[PDB]
Amino acid sequence: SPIETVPVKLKPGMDGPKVKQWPLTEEKIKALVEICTEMEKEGKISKIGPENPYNTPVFAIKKSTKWRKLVDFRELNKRTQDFWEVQLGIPHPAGLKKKKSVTVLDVGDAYFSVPLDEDFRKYTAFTIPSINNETPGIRYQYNVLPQGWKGSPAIFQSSMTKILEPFKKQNPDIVIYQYMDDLYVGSDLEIGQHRTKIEELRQHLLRWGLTTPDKKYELHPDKWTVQPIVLPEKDSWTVNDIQKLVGKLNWASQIYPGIKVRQLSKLLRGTKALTEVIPLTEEAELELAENREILKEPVHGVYYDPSKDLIAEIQKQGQGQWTYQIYQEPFKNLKTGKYARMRGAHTNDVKQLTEAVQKITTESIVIWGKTPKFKLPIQKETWETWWTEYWQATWIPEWEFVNTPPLVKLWYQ
Amino acid sequence: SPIETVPVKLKPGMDGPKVKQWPLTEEKIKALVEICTEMEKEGKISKIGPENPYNTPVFAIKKKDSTKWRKLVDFRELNKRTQDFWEVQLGIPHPAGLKKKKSVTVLDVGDAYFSVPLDEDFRKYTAFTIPSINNETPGIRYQYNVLPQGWKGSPAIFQSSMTKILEPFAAQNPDIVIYQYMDDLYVGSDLEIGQHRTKIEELRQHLLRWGLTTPDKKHQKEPPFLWMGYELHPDKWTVQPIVLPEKDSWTVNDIQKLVGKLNWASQIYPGIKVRQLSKLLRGTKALTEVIPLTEEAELELAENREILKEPVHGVYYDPSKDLIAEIQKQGQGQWTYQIYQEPFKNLKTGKYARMRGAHTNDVKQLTEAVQKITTESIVIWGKTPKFKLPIQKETWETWWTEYWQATWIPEWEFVNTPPLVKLWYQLEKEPIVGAETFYVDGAANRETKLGKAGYVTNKGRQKVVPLTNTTNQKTELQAIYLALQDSGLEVNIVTDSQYALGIIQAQPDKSESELVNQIIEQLIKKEKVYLAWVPAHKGIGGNEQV
Numbered sequence: 034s035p036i037e038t039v040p041v042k043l044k045p046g047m048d049g050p051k052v053k054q055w056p057l058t059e060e061k062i063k064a065l066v067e068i069c070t071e072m073e074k075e076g077k078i079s080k081i082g083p084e085n086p087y088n089t090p091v092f093a094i095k096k097s098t099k100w101r102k103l104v105d106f107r108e109l110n111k112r113t114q115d116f117w118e119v120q121l122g123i124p125h126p127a128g129l130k131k132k133k134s135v136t137v138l139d140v141g142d143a144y145f146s147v148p149l150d151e152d153f154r155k156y157t158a159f160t161i162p163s164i165n166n167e168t169p170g171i172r173y174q175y176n177v178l179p180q181g182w183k184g185s186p187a188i189f190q191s192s193m194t195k196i197l198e199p200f201k202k203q204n205p206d207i208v209i210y211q212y213m214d215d216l217y218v219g220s221d222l223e224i225g226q227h228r229t230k231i232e233e234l235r236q237h238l239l240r241w242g243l244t245t246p247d248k249k250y251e252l253h254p255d256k257w258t259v260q261p262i263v264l265p266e267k268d269s270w271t272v273n274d275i276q277k278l279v280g281k282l283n284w285a286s287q288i289y290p291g292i293k294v295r296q297l298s299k300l301l302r303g304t305k306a307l308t309e310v311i312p313l314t315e316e317a318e319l320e321l322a323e324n325r326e327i328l329k330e331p332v333h334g335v336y337y338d339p340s341k342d343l344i345a346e347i348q349k350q351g352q353g354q355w356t357y358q359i360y361q362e363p364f365k366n367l368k369t370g371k372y373a374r375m376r377g378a379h380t381n382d383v384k385q386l387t388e389a390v391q392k393i394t395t396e397s398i399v400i401w402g403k404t405p406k407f408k409l410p411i412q413k414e415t416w417e418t419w420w421t422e423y424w425q426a427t428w429i430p431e432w433e434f435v436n437t438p439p440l441v442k443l444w445y446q
Numbered sequence: 447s448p449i450e451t452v453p454v455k456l457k458p459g460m461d462g463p464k465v466k467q468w469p470l471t472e473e474k475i476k477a478l479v480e481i482c483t484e485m486e487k488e489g490k491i492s493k494i495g496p497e498n499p500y501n502t503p504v505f506a507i508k509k510k511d512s513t514k515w516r517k518l519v520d521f522r523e524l525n526k527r528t529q530d531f532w533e534v535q536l537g538i539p540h541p542a543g544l545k546k547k548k549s550v551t552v553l554d555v556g557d558a559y560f561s562v563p564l565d566e567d568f569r570k571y572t573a574f575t576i577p578s579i580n581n582e583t584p585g586i587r588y589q590y591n592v593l594p595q596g597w598k599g600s601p602a603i604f605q606s607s608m609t610k611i612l613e614p615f616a617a618q619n620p621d622i623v624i625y626q627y628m629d630d631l632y633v634g635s636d637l638e639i640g641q642h643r644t645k646i647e648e649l650r651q652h653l654l655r656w657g658l659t660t661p662d663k664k665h666q667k668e669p670p671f672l673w674m675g676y677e678l679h680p681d682k683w684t685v686q687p688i689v690l691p692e693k694d695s696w697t698v699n700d701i702q703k704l705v706g707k708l709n710w711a712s713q714i715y716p717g718i719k720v721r722q723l724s725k726l727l728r729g730t731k732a733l734t735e736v737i738p739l740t741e742e743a744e745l746e747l748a749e750n751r752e753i754l755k756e757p758v759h760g761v762y763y764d765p766s767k768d769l770i771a772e773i774q775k776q777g778q779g780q781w782t783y784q785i786y787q788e789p790f791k792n793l794k795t796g797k798y799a800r801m802r803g804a805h806t807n808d809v810k811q812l813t814e815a816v817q818k819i820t821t822e823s824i825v826i827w828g829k830t831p832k833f834k835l836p837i838q839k840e841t842w843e844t845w846w847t848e849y850w851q852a853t854w855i856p857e858w859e860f861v862n863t864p865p866l867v868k869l870w871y872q873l874e875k876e877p878i879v880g881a882e883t884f885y886v887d888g889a890a891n892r893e894t895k896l897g898k899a900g901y902v903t904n905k906g907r908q909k910v911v912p913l914t915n916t917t918n919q920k921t922e923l924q925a926i927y928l929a930l931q932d933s934g935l936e937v938n939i940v941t942d943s944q945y946a947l948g949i950i951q952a953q954p955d956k957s958e959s960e961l962v963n964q965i966i967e968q969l970i971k972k973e974k975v976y977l978a979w980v981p982a983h984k985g986i987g988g989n990e991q992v
């Protein structure tokens with residue numbers, strides 16, 4: 034106890050989180066018991082009685098070949114951080130998304146030193162489940178700053194600034210942003226000098242008592258932009274190809290209202306066979322090429338509204354390819370991309386969507402400083418079973434599950 | 447006193463109950479003093495003075511064999527004001543997840559709640575007064591020194607107390623297994639029957655040292671073990687005998703009880719179906735309305751009676767043996783499965799019916815069934831089973847590659863047991879060269895409910911059929927069905943409806959709509975079908991009428 038605990042107070046008129054515990058594998062339950070038993074000896078967590086009605090989910094991820102414990106503090110965050118982002122919030126630099134290389138460093142070990150406010154410890158309660166409802170479960174609560182809770186970096190913020198101050202003086206062109214458990218370090222240096230300066234920061238933090246398990250994940254934010262909608266270009270065109278072209282250009286009119294399709298729809302008068310090859314007129318080629326360059330320029334009036342939340346839609350494209358869009362209001366995409374994992378006998382759908390969500394969330398953290406809510410194309414119960422299998426991040430974004438994706442599949446590739 | 451109390455607070459910004467009671471005649475007043483004095487001697491309650499405390503209504507009532515009275519305190523207003531506690535174990539353990547032990551012992555603790563003390567700084571809120579006949583004689587005030595019967599935090603505190611009491615015993619006896627459930631204890635071990643009886647007696651004397659009584663008379667229970675509607679035999683488990691009543695008139699209440707026993711019997715009795723009887727309960731508008739039966743419901747109930755006629759049992763879990771699950775289709779959007787480790791012995795069975803939506807194919811329903819079994823296995827056994835599925839590998843590999851959603855199925859081997867699961871038709875990905883192109887369209891007036899559906903082909907063939915009592919969605923599906931009727935084995939269809947296309951591209955196998963079913967039949971009878979889409983009012987090649 035270096036200094037008296039920072040008093041944590043929830044927003045007035047709101048009770049703590051009471052979330053259910055999803056059933057876990059016997060393998061995962063045994064891992065959590067070993068971790069929590071060690072955390073109990075080291076004074077981090079302590080068992081609680083029945084007068085603690087709150088609960089918070091706890092899972093087991095693979096960090097590596099050893100088990101790592103991940104807590105779903107999403108509900109406690111919205112019950113504390115929404116009032117704590119105003120009080121001890123961390124500002125987000127808008128220049129981090131402009132560097133050439135951004136490395137992520139896990140600094141979640143620092144919170145294990147700071148004590149947690151005794152009155153607030155009852156809200157960090159979590160339960161290790163039992164198989165077949167044999168025992169009522171093992172209920173712990175946190176005595177130190179817990180990982181995954183957004184209040185721990187806000188409390189440790191002043192401590193983090195002091196440690197990073199000498200490094201910032203030696204490197205005034207390096208951007209360092211902290212999000213919960215991760216230290217985003219971006220620079221414009223060469224790849225060799227970047228990893229050298231990253232190692233210097235690793236050795237700098239390590240010699241100040243801040244251990245970071247990264248003894249052998251870099252990004253490049255200058256390549257993250259709204260991808261342009263490409264129109265197919267074939268040597269010849271048939272009735273069916275022009276139908277898919279006008280239908281796609283009509284859907285694009287909701288985004289670019291300066292698109293005309295009267296000359297493309299006049300090339301086919303009607304009652305023609307689908308496989309009938311139809312050459313284009315000059316005004317059809319003029320209207321086509323005119324609608325190509327207007328589709329290769331970004332939209333007008335598309336800005337980020339901090340008051341509104343971020344929304345990310347993902348859709349399956351097959352052959353290990355996934356496309357996504359990030360917006361706040363419909364058809365106002367702030368950022369679009371396409372995630373692609375190497376196919377083979379080493380991958381499946383759920384693994385690809387999981388890594389895609391983690392890649393999108395990391396991009397949204399760097400660009401805007403907050404995570405989006407995902408509209409996932411997967412069955413709810415299915416995703417809630419296997420999402421921890423391939424999850425490597427230390428945070429958990431919000432998500433909901435959709436069931437009716439239209440013909441958009443072809444329109445976004 | 448040796449049992450450490452649990453600190454209980456009132457809800458933030460609240461105060462104890464100040465309700466008072468003056469009814470209940472003089473006959474039961476002295477009948478309640480007979481109980482209050484013996485409870486005061488045992489330290490369960492203590493008289494409190496005129497310190498202006500709180501109060502709570504307390505009632506009295508007899509029962510059958512009236513030699514034993516009953517004191518019933520109504521803590522309804524108090525439970526609204528006390529804090530919230532960690533919820534007691536909601537789900538009971540399932541017998542199919544239990545392991546085989548040579549000996550099993552059951553012990554129920556008498557006066558369980560009155561054996562655990564109450565927090566001292568909270569006992570003042572549980573006060574109550576026995577009314578005297580108002581001859582200006584005052585009322586006798588009491589308050590509880592233990593967990594009150596019917597109080598909000600009594601079950602959760604007693605469970606925490608019982609668990610702590612078992613800790614110094616389970617530490618010296620790791621070979622025996624003690625299950626905990628409400629006021630009962632289910633001890634079991636592989637110890638020899640001689641030393642097992644001694645371990646039970648040692649545990650009884652241990653619990654008695656903390657003030658917990660245990661049946662010394664005989665041994666209380668024998669291997670039948672009627673527990674929570676189950677039969678727990680030393681080498682098998684089954685549900686308690688199911689009784690299906692027979693009536694001429696059936697009400698909504700009885701049909702709810704009927705599907706309740708049927709769903710309960712579906713744990714081990716394989717083949718139970720409840721689709722038709724639940725279709726009767728689709729009408730939520732009633733309490734005791736006489737709902738008439740259907741012909742399909744009477745037949746389905748007759749099939750359930752034939753299954754319940756022959757008793758079938760289940761077995762316990764052996765972790766050394768693998769966990770297997772096998773699924774079969776019943777043909778009405780219903781599915782059935784069995785979880786087992788041995789060929790002739792089942793751990794438990796179950797069924798899955800898709801009552802969500804109206805259009806779905808068998809491959810999707812098979813996936814959702816595997817999901818339900820996967821969750822149930824992680825709950826009951828903590829692992830996931832190996833699946834034997836009646837579906838070719840090329841079948842499922844083609845479906846998930848085409849399906850817009852993300853799916854995942856664990857290690858599964860193909861079992862060749864009809865009816866197998868297979869896509870009955872696949873639409874062409876590219877337009878068919880040399881096939882007649884149908885430009886279909888359907889419209890309807892929502893007020894008159896009289897629409898029309900037709901088509902125009904590239905060969906100069908046109909047709910318009912009038913429709914009565916339909917909607918715009920029905921006409922658009924009717925227009926596509928009309929093209930399939932009047933076309934060869936290869937046909938190209940072009941529609942302007944995003945609705946009718948999404949229903950077809952889902953490739954469903956069955957549906958309640960006979961129109962969609964006949965569309966499915968046409969799509970199977972064809973050889974190659976390519977269905978394209980164009981915007982509704984762009985005048986590309988579509989001809990529509992208003």
Ligand SMILES: N#Cc1cc2c(Oc3ccc(F)cc3OCCn3ccc(=O)[nH]c3=O)cc(F)cn2c1
Pocket residue numbers: 539544545546547548549550551552623624625632633634635667669671672673678679680681
């Ligand atoms: N009434 C009641 C009652 C008793 C139990 C219960 O007892 C058990 C405790 C520990 C164990 F390792 C196995 C147990 O039961 C397996 C079945 N069994 C029965 C008799 C026999 O001789 N052998 C045998 O295997 C477990 C539970 F979850 C609920 N219970 C309700």
